Each structure stands twice: as structure tokens, then as C-alpha cells.
Amino acid sequence: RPGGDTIFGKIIRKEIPAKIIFEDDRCLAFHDISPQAPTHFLVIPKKHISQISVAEDDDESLLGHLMIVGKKCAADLGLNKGYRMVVNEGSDGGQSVYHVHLHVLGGRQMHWPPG
Amino acid sequence: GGDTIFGKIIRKEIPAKIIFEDDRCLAFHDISPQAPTHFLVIPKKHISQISVAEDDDESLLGHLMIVGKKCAADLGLNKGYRMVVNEGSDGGQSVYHVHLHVLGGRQMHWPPG
Ligand SMILES: Nc1ncnc2c1ncn2[C@@H]1O[C@H](COP(=O)(O)O)[C@@H](O)[C@H]1O
């Protein structure tokens, strides 16, 4: 199916609700249901890729597009003091949804280390 | 390139533990590691921060991520890892040259700072 089997595929196909910030032919940005900062959203590809560790070389433009859309949405949402982008891979990364996605968190001071 | 310590590293003016290099990026271990494995992937093009990257940079930015995941595999991070890009003061960005952090070798926690 276009978008894959995960809950994010269901969001892509409008089968379950989401608070969408931006949508184009390649990706979708929507707010996280369990925000870890005053603003916390996800940017995901419409093509299903399970996790960054299995992305193909020809996925480079798409992955870069997630970041460009992330920074554009951050600006549009007024995160003028900055933000943090995160990709969680696998068990040590704490990954819970196996559809590649970029977190964007802001609206407060982010601390170091990043988890 | 550029007028930061990362520019000096790219130009080979100061040492760094280099993991991978090509014509457009460089990966090297972070000098202040926050996990048993903690390295950076940076473009050779001086983009000061992700907020000023242009559409034309999309494939370069994606290239950083692909290089990052390949380096992670080569460094034996088979249990996973976390990638991070910091922007500005709230993001805790330490150097104004875009850089992708890759951290692994321990459980990464939530929230991510
Ligand atoms: N239905 C949903 N809508 C929005 N965000 C979600 C939904 N289900 C899970 N998430 C978020 O997706 C992320 C998945 O975890 P991880 O794979 O570590 O990034 C978490 O931040 C969740 O809160």
C-alpha cells in the first residue's frame, strides 16, 4: 500500500487523524501526539522506508527533502530561537515506529547530551 | 570550508580522527563524545546552519545521512543509534557549520535533551 502498514501509513492515507502542518508529493509533516517540547513535529516520507539503516543510496534526495521541509516548517511555526532535529534508529535509538521520520523539537532550551 | 573549527578540520589544519571522507563531506569522531560511539558528518560546503540551507542542498543533506548510516554500520552499531542536527541557541548548536551527530553504543533516552 502507498505509505506502508505502520500507523504513519494510515496517517498518510488519511485513515486516522493527524494535525498536518505541510504536505507534498514526497512527504508529510504533522504534530507529535506525545510532544517532548512546546513544539514537536515529525516529517515523514510518503514512500515507506522502515528505518534509516536500510535507506538506499538513491533515497538521498528524499532524506534531504525531509530536512529542508523540517527547517521550513520550523520557520513557519515561529521557532526563531532554534530547534533540534532527531532520527531514532533501532533499539538503542529508542525507535518505536518503523517508518523513517525526522523529529523537530523547539520552543524551549534543548539540553546536552541529546538523550 | 569556512571560518570555524570545522573548516580547520576540513582543511586538515588541525587533527581529527577521520572515519570517512569524499569530495563533499567528512565524518570524524566528536572531541567531546556523549556516547561510546559519537561522530559527526559535515558537508565541505560551508552551510552555517540548517535554517539557511537551500532546496539545491537537498541531496547533499541526504548524503550526510547516508554517509552517517554507513559509518554507523562500519563502526558496529548494530543495535541502533540516534542522529541529531542542532539549530541555533535553543537547539544547542555549538559550531556554525552544519553537522550531523551520530550517537550509539548505549541506550539513548527520551526526551532527546
Ligand atoms: N498517531 C500518532 N500521531 C502522531 N505521532 C505519533 C503517533 N503515534 C506515534 N507517534 C509519535 O511517533 C514517535 C515514534 O517514536 P520513535 O520511532 O522513537 O521516533 C513518537 O514521538 C510518538 O509520540
Short mmCIF file of C-alpha atoms and ligand atoms in Angstrom, two decimals:
data_model
loop_
_atom_site.label_atom_id
_atom_site.label_comp_id
_atom_site.label_asym_id
_atom_site.label_seq_id
_atom_site.Cartn_x
_atom_site.Cartn_y
_atom_site.Cartn_z
CA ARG A 1 0.00 0.00 0.00
CA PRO A 2 1.15 3.55 -0.63
CA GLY A 3 2.58 4.63 2.70
CA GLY A 4 3.07 1.19 4.22
CA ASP A 5 1.49 -0.73 7.11
CA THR A 6 2.50 1.34 10.13
CA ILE A 7 0.35 3.89 11.85
CA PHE A 8 2.21 6.51 9.75
CA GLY A 9 0.97 4.85 6.55
CA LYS A 10 -2.54 5.20 7.93
CA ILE A 11 -1.88 8.89 8.59
CA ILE A 12 -0.56 9.35 5.03
CA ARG A 13 -3.74 7.84 3.58
CA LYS A 14 -5.97 9.91 5.90
CA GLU A 15 -7.33 6.76 7.59
CA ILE A 16 -6.52 8.04 11.07
CA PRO A 17 -6.36 11.67 12.14
CA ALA A 18 -3.34 13.90 12.36
CA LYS A 19 -2.61 17.59 12.79
CA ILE A 20 -0.91 18.25 9.49
CA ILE A 21 1.50 21.14 9.01
CA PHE A 22 2.69 20.53 5.44
CA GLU A 23 2.10 18.02 2.68
CA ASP A 24 3.66 17.48 -0.72
CA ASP A 25 4.11 14.59 -3.15
CA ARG A 26 7.13 13.27 -1.23
CA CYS A 27 6.45 13.86 2.45
CA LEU A 28 4.15 14.89 5.25
CA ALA A 29 4.75 16.95 8.42
CA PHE A 30 2.42 16.59 11.42
CA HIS A 31 2.48 17.22 15.17
CA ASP A 32 3.67 14.51 17.54
CA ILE A 33 0.95 13.05 19.80
CA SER A 34 3.36 12.96 22.75
CA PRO A 35 5.29 16.23 22.44
CA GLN A 36 8.64 16.46 24.24
CA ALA A 37 8.92 20.21 23.70
CA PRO A 38 6.44 23.07 23.30
CA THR A 39 6.64 22.46 19.53
CA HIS A 40 7.33 18.89 18.45
CA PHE A 41 6.50 17.61 14.97
CA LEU A 42 7.53 14.83 12.59
CA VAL A 43 8.49 14.91 8.93
CA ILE A 44 7.98 11.61 7.15
CA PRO A 45 8.38 10.34 3.59
CA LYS A 46 5.28 9.13 1.78
CA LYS A 47 7.42 6.25 0.47
CA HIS A 48 7.75 3.60 3.17
CA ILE A 49 11.32 3.12 4.37
CA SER A 50 11.41 1.17 7.63
CA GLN A 51 14.40 2.87 9.24
CA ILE A 52 17.40 4.96 8.29
CA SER A 53 19.74 1.95 8.46
CA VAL A 54 18.06 0.42 5.38
CA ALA A 55 17.73 3.58 3.27
CA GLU A 56 19.16 3.22 -0.25
CA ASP A 57 21.72 5.49 -1.91
CA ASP A 58 19.02 6.80 -4.24
CA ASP A 59 16.99 7.89 -1.20
CA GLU A 60 19.43 10.78 -0.61
CA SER A 61 17.30 13.49 -2.19
CA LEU A 62 14.22 12.33 -0.28
CA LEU A 63 16.04 12.27 3.05
CA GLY A 64 17.46 15.73 2.40
CA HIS A 65 13.95 16.90 1.49
CA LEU A 66 12.73 15.82 4.92
CA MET A 67 15.31 18.14 6.47
CA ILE A 68 14.51 21.05 4.19
CA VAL A 69 10.79 20.65 4.89
CA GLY A 70 11.61 20.36 8.60
CA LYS A 71 13.50 23.64 8.63
CA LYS A 72 10.83 25.39 6.55
CA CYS A 73 8.03 24.21 8.84
CA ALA A 74 10.08 25.26 11.89
CA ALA A 75 10.36 28.78 10.45
CA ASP A 76 6.66 28.87 9.55
CA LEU A 77 5.87 27.82 13.14
CA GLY A 78 7.99 30.66 14.50
CA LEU A 79 10.86 28.65 16.01
CA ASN A 80 13.14 31.64 15.59
CA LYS A 81 15.41 30.75 18.52
CA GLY A 82 16.26 27.33 17.15
CA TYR A 83 15.31 23.66 17.32
CA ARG A 84 16.69 20.14 17.28
CA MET A 85 16.19 17.50 14.58
CA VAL A 86 16.37 13.85 15.57
CA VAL A 87 16.26 10.44 13.90
CA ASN A 88 15.88 7.40 16.18
CA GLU A 89 17.28 4.15 14.75
CA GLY A 90 16.59 0.75 16.25
CA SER A 91 16.63 -0.37 19.85
CA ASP A 92 19.47 1.85 21.11
CA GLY A 93 17.91 4.80 19.30
CA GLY A 94 14.61 4.08 21.03
CA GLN A 95 12.78 3.65 17.73
CA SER A 96 9.11 2.75 18.13
CA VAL A 97 7.56 3.35 14.68
CA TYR A 98 9.42 1.62 11.84
CA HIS A 99 8.69 4.18 9.15
CA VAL A 100 11.58 6.61 8.80
CA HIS A 101 10.90 10.02 10.29
CA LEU A 102 12.60 13.20 11.42
CA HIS A 103 11.59 14.78 14.74
CA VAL A 104 11.77 18.56 15.03
CA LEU A 105 11.65 19.92 18.60
CA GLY A 106 11.72 23.52 19.76
CA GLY A 107 10.17 26.25 21.84
CA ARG A 108 12.43 25.56 24.82
CA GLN A 109 16.13 25.20 25.50
CA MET A 110 17.28 21.73 24.40
CA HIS A 111 19.94 20.12 26.59
CA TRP A 112 23.08 18.08 26.02
CA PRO A 113 23.50 15.15 25.71
CA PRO A 114 20.52 14.61 23.38
CA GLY A 115 19.28 11.69 25.46
CA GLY B 1 35.18 25.32 4.23
CA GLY B 2 34.53 28.38 6.34
CA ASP B 3 35.71 30.29 9.38
CA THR B 4 35.01 27.77 12.13
CA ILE B 5 36.98 25.00 13.78
CA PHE B 6 35.20 22.56 11.44
CA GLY B 7 36.66 24.47 8.49
CA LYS B 8 40.10 23.93 10.03
CA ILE B 9 39.35 20.22 10.27
CA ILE B 10 38.22 20.05 6.62
CA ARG B 11 41.40 21.89 5.54
CA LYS B 12 43.49 19.43 7.62
CA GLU B 13 44.95 22.32 9.62
CA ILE B 14 44.17 20.65 12.93
CA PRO B 15 43.85 16.95 13.66
CA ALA B 16 40.67 14.90 13.97
CA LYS B 17 40.00 11.18 13.96
CA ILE B 18 38.63 10.84 10.46
CA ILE B 19 36.25 7.96 9.76
CA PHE B 20 35.33 8.69 6.15
CA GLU B 21 35.88 11.35 3.51
CA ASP B 22 34.69 12.00 -0.01
CA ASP B 23 34.62 15.03 -2.34
CA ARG B 24 31.71 16.68 -0.49
CA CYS B 25 31.69 15.62 3.17
CA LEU B 26 33.80 14.44 6.08
CA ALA B 27 32.98 12.15 9.02
CA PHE B 28 35.06 12.25 12.20
CA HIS B 29 34.76 11.38 15.88
CA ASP B 30 33.46 14.12 18.14
CA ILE B 31 36.07 15.55 20.51
CA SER B 32 33.55 15.60 23.38
CA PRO B 33 31.77 12.26 22.93
CA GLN B 34 28.41 11.75 24.65
CA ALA B 35 28.17 8.03 23.91
CA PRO B 36 30.65 5.19 23.41
CA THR B 37 30.42 5.99 19.70
CA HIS B 38 29.79 9.62 18.79
CA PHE B 39 30.83 11.07 15.45
CA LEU B 40 29.89 13.91 13.13
CA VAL B 41 29.23 14.08 9.42
CA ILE B 42 29.71 17.52 7.90
CA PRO B 43 29.49 18.97 4.40
CA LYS B 44 32.62 20.51 2.94
CA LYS B 45 30.40 23.35 1.69
CA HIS B 46 30.08 25.95 4.44
CA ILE B 47 26.41 25.98 5.29
CA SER B 48 26.33 27.77 8.65
CA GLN B 49 23.12 26.21 9.95
CA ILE B 50 20.30 24.04 8.67
CA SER B 51 17.90 27.02 8.77
CA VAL B 52 19.79 28.63 5.84
CA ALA B 53 20.13 25.52 3.67
CA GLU B 54 18.57 25.89 0.21
CA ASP B 55 16.47 23.48 -1.87
CA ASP B 56 19.54 22.84 -4.03
CA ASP B 57 21.23 21.41 -0.93
CA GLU B 58 18.69 18.63 -0.51
CA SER B 59 20.76 15.81 -1.95
CA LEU B 60 23.89 16.96 -0.07
CA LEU B 61 21.96 16.92 3.20
CA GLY B 62 20.62 13.46 2.40
CA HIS B 63 24.18 12.40 1.57
CA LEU B 64 25.22 13.31 5.12
CA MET B 65 22.57 10.92 6.45
CA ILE B 66 23.51 8.09 4.10
CA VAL B 67 27.21 8.51 4.97
CA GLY B 68 26.19 8.63 8.64
CA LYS B 69 24.27 5.37 8.47
CA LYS B 70 27.08 3.67 6.51
CA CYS B 71 29.68 4.83 9.03
CA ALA B 72 27.45 3.64 11.88
CA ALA B 73 27.32 0.18 10.32
CA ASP B 74 31.08 0.15 9.78
CA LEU B 75 31.61 1.12 13.43
CA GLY B 76 29.47 -1.83 14.51
CA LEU B 77 26.36 0.00 15.73
CA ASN B 78 24.10 -2.97 15.04
CA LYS B 79 21.74 -2.20 17.95
CA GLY B 80 20.91 1.26 16.60
CA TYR B 81 21.81 4.89 17.14
CA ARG B 82 20.48 8.44 17.18
CA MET B 83 21.08 11.15 14.59
CA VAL B 84 20.88 14.79 15.62
CA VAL B 85 21.08 18.19 13.95
CA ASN B 86 21.16 21.20 16.26
CA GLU B 87 19.93 24.62 15.11
CA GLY B 88 20.58 27.88 16.92
CA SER B 89 20.58 28.68 20.61
CA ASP B 90 17.54 26.62 21.64
CA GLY B 91 18.90 23.71 19.59
CA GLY B 92 22.23 23.92 21.40
CA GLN B 93 24.18 24.34 18.18
CA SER B 94 27.84 24.56 19.18
CA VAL B 95 29.53 25.36 15.84
CA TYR B 96 28.03 27.39 12.99
CA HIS B 97 28.85 24.83 10.32
CA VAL B 98 26.07 22.30 9.71
CA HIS B 99 26.83 18.95 11.32
CA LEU B 100 25.00 15.67 11.76
CA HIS B 101 25.70 13.91 15.08
CA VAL B 102 25.53 10.12 15.21
CA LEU B 103 25.50 8.59 18.69
CA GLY B 104 25.35 4.94 19.72
CA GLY B 105 26.87 2.16 21.77
CA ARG B 106 24.48 2.83 24.65
CA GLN B 107 20.74 3.21 25.16
CA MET B 108 19.66 6.68 24.01
CA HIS B 109 16.91 8.15 26.17
CA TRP B 110 13.76 10.25 25.75
CA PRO B 111 13.35 13.20 25.61
CA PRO B 112 16.41 13.81 23.38
CA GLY B 113 17.60 16.64 25.60
N1 LIG C 1 -0.74 8.53 15.80
C1 LIG C 1 0.34 9.33 16.01
N2 LIG C 1 0.34 10.64 15.68
C2 LIG C 1 1.41 11.43 15.88
N3 LIG C 1 2.57 11.00 16.42
C3 LIG C 1 2.68 9.70 16.79
C4 LIG C 1 1.57 8.78 16.59
N4 LIG C 1 1.95 7.58 17.04
C5 LIG C 1 3.22 7.72 17.47
N5 LIG C 1 3.66 8.99 17.32
C6 LIG C 1 4.97 9.52 17.69
O1 LIG C 1 5.94 8.95 16.83
C7 LIG C 1 7.20 8.79 17.54
C8 LIG C 1 7.66 7.36 17.37
O2 LIG C 1 8.81 7.08 18.18
P1 LIG C 1 10.25 6.93 17.51
O3 LIG C 1 10.19 5.88 16.43
O4 LIG C 1 11.27 6.75 18.60
O5 LIG C 1 10.50 8.27 16.87
C9 LIG C 1 6.93 9.21 18.99
O6 LIG C 1 7.41 10.54 19.23
C10 LIG C 1 5.40 9.15 19.10
O7 LIG C 1 4.83 10.00 20.06
#
